[PDB]
Specification:
globular; mainly beta; about 30 residues
Length: about 30
Amino acid sequence: GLPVCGETCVGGTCNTPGCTCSWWPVCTRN
């Protein structure tokens, strides 16, 4: 739930394993 992935999820799909798209369209870790 923390934007530290450095990436975004425009489609709600994060690349980095461990990230999740909680605050769309930005990826979040925890």
